[PDB]
């Protein structure tokens, strides 16, 4: 569903500066700037 | 800022020195192409403890 | 009276380089450092070590000091 | 007991990795930022001594 | 020399502007003033 919402993990380094990580209980699975961060957060929940 | 080789990953010996050449892949590049590198290096803010940073902040 | 309470307050107080200093800039190539002090009037305000005092000490003890601790680190990665 | 491993050597042993790799995967960002620049360039040549 | 490694200049230079002094008396530091109308110095 991360990868379906807007994120993607890299094999090659796929980040930049503004880009924030995003952890499934210890083990990178994206990187996405806070405001889409914040947006999965809430929708997550609200699916939850 | 930094002189990374382009076919293995070794970072290159510093020029100043002589040539450039890496020690696994033995590659060969001109040496002169990234001379004078210039790195300007800044003290983080918030780092000197003062008397009158509270007449700045 | 209360300009001279200051003024010996000053005097007997000690202070360190790092309190007139503002932030410390270093270019690497030579190698340099530049440090940036505070205008001399707000410098004057909370202190009133003059210029020269701070030429003449910055120069000798903070060649002292800088070479000082470069030599630590620089012993130090010897090993 | 405790165990003390420099943790370049790790990262280089974990996958089959050049020194790029892990210099752009720490601080690939704001190409240059000084601080992380630095450290990390000092880290590399520590572990290759 | 260019054989020496980097200098983590910036932490060198904090730690010298840090640890030199311009005027100290031996041992004294922190005159302050605390108020009987009668003007004091407490140092520490
Ligand atoms: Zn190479």
Known sequence: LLLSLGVDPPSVVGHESGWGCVQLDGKIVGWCTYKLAKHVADVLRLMK | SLIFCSECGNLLESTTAQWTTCDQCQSVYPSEQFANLV???????????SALKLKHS | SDKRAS?????????????????????EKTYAIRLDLYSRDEYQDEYGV??????????????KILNRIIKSYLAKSKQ | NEYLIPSMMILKALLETSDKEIFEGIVGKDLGNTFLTDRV???????KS | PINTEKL?????????????????????????????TVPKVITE
């Not at chain 2, 790195?39 to 403890?49: D, G, I, L, R």
């Open chain 3, 50 to 63: 003059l210029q020269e005092e701070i030429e003449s000490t910055f120069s000798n003890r903070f060649l």
């Open chain 5, 8 to 36: 983590l200049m910036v932490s060198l230079v904090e730690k010298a502007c840090s640890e030199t002094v311009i005027h100290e008396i031996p041992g004294i530091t922190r005159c302050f003033s605390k108020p009987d």
């Open chain 4, 41 to 47: 360039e000092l880290m590399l040549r520590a572990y």
């Open chain 3, 7 to 27: 003024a010996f307050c000053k005097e007997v107080n000690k202070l360190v380089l790092s309190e007139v200093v503002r932030q410390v800039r270093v270019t």
């Open chain 2, 39 to 49: 790195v300007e290096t800044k003290s983080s803010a918030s780092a000197f403890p």
